[PDB]
Coordinates of N, CA and C in Angstrom, one line a residue:
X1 N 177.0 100.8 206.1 CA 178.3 100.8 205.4 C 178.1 100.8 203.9
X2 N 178.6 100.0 203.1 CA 178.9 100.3 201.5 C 178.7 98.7 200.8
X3 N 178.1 99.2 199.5 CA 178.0 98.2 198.4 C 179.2 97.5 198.7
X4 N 179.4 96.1 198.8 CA 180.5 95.0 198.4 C 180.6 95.3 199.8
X5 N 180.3 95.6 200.3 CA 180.9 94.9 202.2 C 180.1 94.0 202.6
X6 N 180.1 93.0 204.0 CA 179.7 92.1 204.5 C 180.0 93.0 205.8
X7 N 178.8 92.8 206.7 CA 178.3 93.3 207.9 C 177.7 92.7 208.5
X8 N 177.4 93.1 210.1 CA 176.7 92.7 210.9 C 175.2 92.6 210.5
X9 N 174.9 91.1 210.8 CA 173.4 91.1 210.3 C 172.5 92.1 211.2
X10 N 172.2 92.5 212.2 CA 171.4 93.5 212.8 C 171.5 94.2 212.2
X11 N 173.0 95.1 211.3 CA 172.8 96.6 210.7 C 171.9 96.6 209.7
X12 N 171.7 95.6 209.1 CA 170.6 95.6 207.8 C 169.2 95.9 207.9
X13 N 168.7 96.5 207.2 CA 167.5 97.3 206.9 C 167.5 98.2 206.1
X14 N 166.1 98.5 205.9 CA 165.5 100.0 205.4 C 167.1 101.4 205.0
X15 N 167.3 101.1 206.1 CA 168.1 102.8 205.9 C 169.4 102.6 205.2
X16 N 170.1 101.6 205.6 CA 171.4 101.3 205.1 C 171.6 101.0 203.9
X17 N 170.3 100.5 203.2 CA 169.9 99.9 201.5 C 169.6 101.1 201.2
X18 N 169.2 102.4 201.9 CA 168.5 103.6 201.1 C 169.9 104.6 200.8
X19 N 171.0 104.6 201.8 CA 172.5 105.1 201.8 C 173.3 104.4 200.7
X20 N 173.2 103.0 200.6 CA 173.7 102.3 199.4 C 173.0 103.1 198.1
X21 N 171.7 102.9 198.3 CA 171.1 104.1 197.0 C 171.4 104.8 196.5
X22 N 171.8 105.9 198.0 CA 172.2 107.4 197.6 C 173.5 107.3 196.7
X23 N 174.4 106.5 197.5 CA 175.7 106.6 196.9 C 175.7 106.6 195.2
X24 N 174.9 106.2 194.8 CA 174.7 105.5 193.5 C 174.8 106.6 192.5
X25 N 174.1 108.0 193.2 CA 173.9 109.2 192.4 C 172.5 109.3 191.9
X26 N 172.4 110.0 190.9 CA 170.8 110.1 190.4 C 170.7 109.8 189.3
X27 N 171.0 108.3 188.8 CA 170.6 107.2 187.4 C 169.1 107.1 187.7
X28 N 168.4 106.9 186.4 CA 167.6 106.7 186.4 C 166.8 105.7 187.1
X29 N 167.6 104.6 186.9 CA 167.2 103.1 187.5 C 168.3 102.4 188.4
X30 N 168.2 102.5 189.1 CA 169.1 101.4 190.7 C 168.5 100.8 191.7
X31 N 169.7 100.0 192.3 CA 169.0 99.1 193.4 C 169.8 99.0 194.0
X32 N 169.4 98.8 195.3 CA 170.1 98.3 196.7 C 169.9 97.1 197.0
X33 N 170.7 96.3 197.3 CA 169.9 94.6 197.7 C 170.9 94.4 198.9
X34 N 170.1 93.9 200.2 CA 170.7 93.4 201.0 C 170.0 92.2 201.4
X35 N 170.9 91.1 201.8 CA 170.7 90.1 202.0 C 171.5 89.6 203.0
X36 N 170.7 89.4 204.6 CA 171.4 88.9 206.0 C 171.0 86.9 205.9
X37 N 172.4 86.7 206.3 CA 172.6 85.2 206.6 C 172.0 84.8 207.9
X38 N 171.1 83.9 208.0 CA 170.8 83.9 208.9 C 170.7 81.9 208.9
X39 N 171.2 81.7 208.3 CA 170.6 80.1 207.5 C 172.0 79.1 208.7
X40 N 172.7 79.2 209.3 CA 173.4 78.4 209.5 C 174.7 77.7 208.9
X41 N 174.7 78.5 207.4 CA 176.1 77.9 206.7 C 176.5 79.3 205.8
X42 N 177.4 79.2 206.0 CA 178.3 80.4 205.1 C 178.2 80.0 203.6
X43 N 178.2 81.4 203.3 CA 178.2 81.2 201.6 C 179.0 82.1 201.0
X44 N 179.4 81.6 200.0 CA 180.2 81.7 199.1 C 180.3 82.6 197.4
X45 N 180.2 83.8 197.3 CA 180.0 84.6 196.4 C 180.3 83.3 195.1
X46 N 179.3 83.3 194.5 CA 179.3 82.5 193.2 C 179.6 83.4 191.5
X47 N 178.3 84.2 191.6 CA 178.6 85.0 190.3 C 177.1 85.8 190.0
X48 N 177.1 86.9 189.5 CA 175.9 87.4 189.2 C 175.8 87.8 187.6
X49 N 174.8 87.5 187.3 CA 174.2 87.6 185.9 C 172.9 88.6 185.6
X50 N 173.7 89.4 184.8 CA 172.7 90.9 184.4 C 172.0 91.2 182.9
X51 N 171.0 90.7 183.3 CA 169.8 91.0 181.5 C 170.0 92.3 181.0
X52 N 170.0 93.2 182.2 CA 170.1 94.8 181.9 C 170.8 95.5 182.9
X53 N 171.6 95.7 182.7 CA 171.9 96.9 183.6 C 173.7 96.2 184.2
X54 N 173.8 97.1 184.9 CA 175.7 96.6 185.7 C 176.0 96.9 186.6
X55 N 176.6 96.4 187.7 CA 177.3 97.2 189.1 C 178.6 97.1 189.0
X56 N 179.1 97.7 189.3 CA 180.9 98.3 189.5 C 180.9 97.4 190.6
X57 N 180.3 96.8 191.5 CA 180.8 96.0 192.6 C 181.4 94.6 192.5
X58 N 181.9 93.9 193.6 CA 182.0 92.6 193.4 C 181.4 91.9 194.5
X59 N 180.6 91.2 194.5 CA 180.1 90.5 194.7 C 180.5 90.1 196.2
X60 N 180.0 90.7 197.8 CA 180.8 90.5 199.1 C 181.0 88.8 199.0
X61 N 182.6 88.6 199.4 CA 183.1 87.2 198.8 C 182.6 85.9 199.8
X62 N 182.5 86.1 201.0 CA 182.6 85.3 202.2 C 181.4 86.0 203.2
X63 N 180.2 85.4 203.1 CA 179.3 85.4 204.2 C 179.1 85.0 205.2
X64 N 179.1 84.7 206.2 CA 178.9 84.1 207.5 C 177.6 84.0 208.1
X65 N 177.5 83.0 208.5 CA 176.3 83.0 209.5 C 176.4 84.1 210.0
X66 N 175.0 85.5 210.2 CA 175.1 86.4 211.2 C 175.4 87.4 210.8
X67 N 176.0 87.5 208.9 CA 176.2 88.6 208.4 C 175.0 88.8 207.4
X68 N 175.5 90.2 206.7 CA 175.1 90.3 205.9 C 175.7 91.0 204.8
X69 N 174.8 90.8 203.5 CA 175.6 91.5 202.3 C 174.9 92.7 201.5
X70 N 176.0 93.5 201.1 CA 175.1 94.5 200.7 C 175.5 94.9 199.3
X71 N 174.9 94.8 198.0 CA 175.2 94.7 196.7 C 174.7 95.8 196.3
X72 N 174.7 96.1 195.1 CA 174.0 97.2 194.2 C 174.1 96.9 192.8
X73 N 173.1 97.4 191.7 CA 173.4 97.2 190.5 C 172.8 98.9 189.6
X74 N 172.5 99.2 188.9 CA 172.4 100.4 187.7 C 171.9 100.0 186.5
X75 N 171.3 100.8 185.7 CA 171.0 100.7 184.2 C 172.2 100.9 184.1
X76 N 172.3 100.2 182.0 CA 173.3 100.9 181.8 C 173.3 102.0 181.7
X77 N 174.5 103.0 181.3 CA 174.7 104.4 181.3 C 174.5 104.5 179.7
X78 N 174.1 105.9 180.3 CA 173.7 106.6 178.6 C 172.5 106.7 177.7
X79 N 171.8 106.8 177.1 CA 170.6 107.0 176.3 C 169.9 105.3 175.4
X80 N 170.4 104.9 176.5 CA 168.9 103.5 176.2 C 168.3 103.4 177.7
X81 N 166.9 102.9 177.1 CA 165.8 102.8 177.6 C 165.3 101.7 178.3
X82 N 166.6 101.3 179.5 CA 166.6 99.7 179.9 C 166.6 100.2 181.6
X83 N 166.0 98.9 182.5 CA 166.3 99.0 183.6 C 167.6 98.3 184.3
X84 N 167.0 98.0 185.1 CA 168.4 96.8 185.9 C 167.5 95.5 186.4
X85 N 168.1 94.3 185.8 CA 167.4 92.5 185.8 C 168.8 92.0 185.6
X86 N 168.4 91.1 186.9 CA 170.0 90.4 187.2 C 169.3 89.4 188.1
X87 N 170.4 88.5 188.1 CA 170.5 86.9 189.2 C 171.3 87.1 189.5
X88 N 171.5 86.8 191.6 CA 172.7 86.9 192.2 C 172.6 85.2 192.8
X89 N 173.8 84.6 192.4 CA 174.1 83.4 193.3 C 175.0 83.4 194.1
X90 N 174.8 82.7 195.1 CA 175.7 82.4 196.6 C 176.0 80.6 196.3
X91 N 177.1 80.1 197.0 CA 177.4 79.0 197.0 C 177.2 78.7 198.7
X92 N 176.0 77.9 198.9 CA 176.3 77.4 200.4 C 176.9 76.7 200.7
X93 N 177.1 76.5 202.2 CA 178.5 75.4 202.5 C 177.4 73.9 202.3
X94 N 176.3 74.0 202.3 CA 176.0 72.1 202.3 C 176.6 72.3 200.8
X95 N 176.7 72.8 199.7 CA 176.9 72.4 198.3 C 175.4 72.8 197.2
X96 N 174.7 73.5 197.8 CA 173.5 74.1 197.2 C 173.8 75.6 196.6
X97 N 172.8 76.2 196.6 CA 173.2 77.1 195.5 C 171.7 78.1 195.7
X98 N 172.2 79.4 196.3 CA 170.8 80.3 196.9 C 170.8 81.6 196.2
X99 N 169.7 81.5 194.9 CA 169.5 82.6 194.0 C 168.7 83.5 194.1
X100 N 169.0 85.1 193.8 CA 167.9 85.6 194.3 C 167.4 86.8 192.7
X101 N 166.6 86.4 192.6 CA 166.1 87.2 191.0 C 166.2 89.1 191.5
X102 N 166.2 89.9 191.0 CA 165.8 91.2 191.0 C 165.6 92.0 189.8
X103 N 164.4 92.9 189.3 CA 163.8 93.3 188.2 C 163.3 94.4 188.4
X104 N 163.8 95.7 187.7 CA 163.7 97.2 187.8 C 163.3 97.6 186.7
X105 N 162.2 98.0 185.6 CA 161.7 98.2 184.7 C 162.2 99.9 185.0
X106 N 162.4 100.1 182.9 CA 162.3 101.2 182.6 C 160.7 101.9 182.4
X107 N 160.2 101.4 181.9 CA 158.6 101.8 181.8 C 157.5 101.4 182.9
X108 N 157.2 101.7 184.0 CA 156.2 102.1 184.7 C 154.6 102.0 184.5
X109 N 154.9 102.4 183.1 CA 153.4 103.1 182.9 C 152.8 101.5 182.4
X110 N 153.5 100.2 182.3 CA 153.3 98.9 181.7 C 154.0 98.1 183.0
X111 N 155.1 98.2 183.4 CA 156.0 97.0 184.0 C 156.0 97.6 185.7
X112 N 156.0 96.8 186.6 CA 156.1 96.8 187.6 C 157.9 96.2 188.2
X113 N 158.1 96.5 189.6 CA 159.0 95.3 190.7 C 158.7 94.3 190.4
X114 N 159.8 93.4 190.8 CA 159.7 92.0 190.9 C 160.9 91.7 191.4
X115 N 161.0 90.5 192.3 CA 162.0 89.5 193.0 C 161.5 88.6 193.2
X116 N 162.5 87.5 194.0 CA 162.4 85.9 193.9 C 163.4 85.6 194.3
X117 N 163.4 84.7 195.1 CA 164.8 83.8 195.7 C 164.1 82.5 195.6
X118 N 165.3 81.5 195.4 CA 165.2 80.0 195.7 C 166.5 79.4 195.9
X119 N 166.4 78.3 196.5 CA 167.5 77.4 196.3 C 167.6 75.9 195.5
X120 N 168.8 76.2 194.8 CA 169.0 75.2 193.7 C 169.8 74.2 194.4
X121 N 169.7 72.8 194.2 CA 170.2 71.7 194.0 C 171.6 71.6 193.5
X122 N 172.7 71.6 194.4 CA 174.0 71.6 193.6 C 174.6 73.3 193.2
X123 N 175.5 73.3 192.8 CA 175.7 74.2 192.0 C 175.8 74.9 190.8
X124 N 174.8 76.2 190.6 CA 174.1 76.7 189.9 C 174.5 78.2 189.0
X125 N 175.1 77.9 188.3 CA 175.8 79.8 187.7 C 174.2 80.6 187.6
X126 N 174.5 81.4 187.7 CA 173.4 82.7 187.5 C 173.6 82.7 185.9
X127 N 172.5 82.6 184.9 CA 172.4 82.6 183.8 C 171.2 83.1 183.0
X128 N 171.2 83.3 181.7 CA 169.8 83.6 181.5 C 168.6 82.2 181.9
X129 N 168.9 81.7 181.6 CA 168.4 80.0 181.8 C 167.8 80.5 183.3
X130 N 168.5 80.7 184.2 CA 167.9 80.6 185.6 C 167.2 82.8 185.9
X131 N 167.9 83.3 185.2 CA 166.5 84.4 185.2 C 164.9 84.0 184.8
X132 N 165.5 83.3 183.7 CA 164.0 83.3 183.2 C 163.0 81.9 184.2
X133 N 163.8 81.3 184.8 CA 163.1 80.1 185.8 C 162.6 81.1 187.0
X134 N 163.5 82.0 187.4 CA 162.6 83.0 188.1 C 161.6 83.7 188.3
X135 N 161.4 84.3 186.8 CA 161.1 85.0 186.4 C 159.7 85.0 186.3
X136 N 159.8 83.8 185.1 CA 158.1 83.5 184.2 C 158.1 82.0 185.3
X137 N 158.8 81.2 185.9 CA 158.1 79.9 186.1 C 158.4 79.7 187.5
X138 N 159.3 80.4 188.0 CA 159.0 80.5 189.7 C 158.1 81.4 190.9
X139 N 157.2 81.6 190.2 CA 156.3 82.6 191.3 C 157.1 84.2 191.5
X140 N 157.3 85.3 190.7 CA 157.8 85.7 191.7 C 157.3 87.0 192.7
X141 N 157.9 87.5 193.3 CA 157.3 88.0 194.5 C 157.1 89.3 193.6
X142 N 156.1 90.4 193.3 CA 156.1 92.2 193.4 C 156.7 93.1 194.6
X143 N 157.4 93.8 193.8 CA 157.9 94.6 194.7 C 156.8 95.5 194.7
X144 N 155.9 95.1 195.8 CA 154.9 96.0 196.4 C 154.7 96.8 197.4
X145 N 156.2 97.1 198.5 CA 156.4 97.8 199.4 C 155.8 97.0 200.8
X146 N 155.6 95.7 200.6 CA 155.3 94.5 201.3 C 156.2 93.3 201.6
X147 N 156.1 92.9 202.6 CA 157.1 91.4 203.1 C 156.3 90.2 202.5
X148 N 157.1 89.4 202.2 CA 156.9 88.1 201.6 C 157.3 87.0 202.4
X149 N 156.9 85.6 202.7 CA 157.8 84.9 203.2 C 157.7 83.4 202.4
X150 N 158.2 82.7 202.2 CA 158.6 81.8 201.4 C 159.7 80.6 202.0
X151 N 159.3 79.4 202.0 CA 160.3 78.3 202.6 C 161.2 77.7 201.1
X152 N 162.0 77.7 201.4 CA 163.0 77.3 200.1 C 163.4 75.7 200.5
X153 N 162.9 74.5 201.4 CA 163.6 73.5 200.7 C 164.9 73.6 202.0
X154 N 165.6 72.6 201.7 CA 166.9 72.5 202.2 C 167.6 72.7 203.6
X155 N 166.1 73.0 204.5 CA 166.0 73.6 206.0 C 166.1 74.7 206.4
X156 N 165.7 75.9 205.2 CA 165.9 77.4 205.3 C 164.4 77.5 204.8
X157 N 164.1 79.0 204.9 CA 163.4 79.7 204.2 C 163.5 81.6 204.5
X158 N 162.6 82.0 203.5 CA 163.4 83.1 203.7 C 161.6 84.5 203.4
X159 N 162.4 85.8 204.1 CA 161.4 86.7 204.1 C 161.9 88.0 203.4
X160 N 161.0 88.5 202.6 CA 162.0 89.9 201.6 C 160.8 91.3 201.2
X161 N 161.5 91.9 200.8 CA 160.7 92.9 201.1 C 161.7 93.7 199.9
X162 N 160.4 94.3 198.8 CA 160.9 95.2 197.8 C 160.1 96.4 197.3
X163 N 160.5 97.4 197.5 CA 159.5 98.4 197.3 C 159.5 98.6 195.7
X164 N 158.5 99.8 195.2 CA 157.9 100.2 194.2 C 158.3 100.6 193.2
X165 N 159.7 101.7 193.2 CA 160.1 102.3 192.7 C 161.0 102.0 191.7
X166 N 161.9 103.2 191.0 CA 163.0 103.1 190.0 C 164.4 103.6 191.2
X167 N 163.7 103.6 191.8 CA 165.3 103.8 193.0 C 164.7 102.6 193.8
X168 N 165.0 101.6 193.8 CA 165.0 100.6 194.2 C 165.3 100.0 195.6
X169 N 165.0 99.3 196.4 CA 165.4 98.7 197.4 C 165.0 97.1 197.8
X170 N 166.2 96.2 197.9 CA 165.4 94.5 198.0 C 165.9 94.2 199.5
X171 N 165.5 93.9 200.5 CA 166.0 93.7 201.6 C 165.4 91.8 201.3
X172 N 166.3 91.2 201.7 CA 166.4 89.9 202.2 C 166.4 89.0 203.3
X173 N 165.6 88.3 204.0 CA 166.5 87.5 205.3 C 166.7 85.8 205.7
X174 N 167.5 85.3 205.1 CA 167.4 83.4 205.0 C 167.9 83.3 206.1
X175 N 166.6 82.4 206.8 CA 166.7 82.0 208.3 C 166.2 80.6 208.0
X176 N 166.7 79.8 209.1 CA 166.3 78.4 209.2 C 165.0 78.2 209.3
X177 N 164.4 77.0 208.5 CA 163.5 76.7 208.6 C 162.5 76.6 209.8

């Protein structure tokens, strides 16, 4: 289906984050991010915060156990030299707060992928304050065209997978611990 919908968590994968891509057109720098619920509590679109770059979308509002979400973000347009670096927050139903970093470099030939998810304590706006906890002081994962898996705390943990590229793809899955 399409950026800003919420879906069946089985539809999510590989192909459906590569159709979100396509849609996007041929920018130099984009991303696909999907992220399936699999955690036991619904979450709550909170807010996303962009270092570089923008998506025309809003943020799928209401997740459910069993769904999933399918986001997208872009460089900006026009003749600067930026990728796309953003924090997306969810509000869980215990009152926590599940962030997930993503980082698309304009230069290659120096900067690689990168992502990260964790869960915060309470509720957390997506900020620069919490990119850069991601970023420089939370481990984060390379988008190396490899699965990751990682326990977050709070009786979840989660597994993600980001490929290489400047056409981007972050697949996500927070499952119970």
């Amino acid at each position: 289906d399409v950026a800003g919908a919420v879906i069946d968590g089985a539809g999510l994968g590989p192909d459906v984050l590569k159709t979100v891509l396509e849609a996007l057109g041929n920018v130099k720098r984009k991303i696909a991010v999907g992220i399936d619920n699999e955690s036991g509590k619904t979450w709550t679109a909170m807010n996303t915060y962009f270092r570089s770059g923008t998506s025309d979308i809003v943020l799928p509002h209401k997740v459910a156990h069993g769904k999933a979400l399918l986001y997208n973000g872009q460089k900006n347009r026009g003749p600067v030299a930026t990728g796309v670096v953003g924090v997306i927050a969810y509000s869980m139903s215990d009152g926590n707060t599940l962030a997930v970093l993503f980082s698309v470099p304009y230069d290659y030939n120096w900067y690689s992928n990168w992502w990260n998810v964790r869960v915060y304590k309470g509720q957390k706006r997506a900020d620069q304050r919490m990119y850069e906890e991601l970023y420089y002081h939370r481990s984060p994962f390379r988008g190396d065209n490899g699965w990751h898996s990682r326990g977050l705390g709070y009786g979840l943990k989660s597994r993600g997978f980001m490929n290489s590229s400047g056409h981007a793809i972050l697949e996500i899955h927070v499952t119970k611990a």
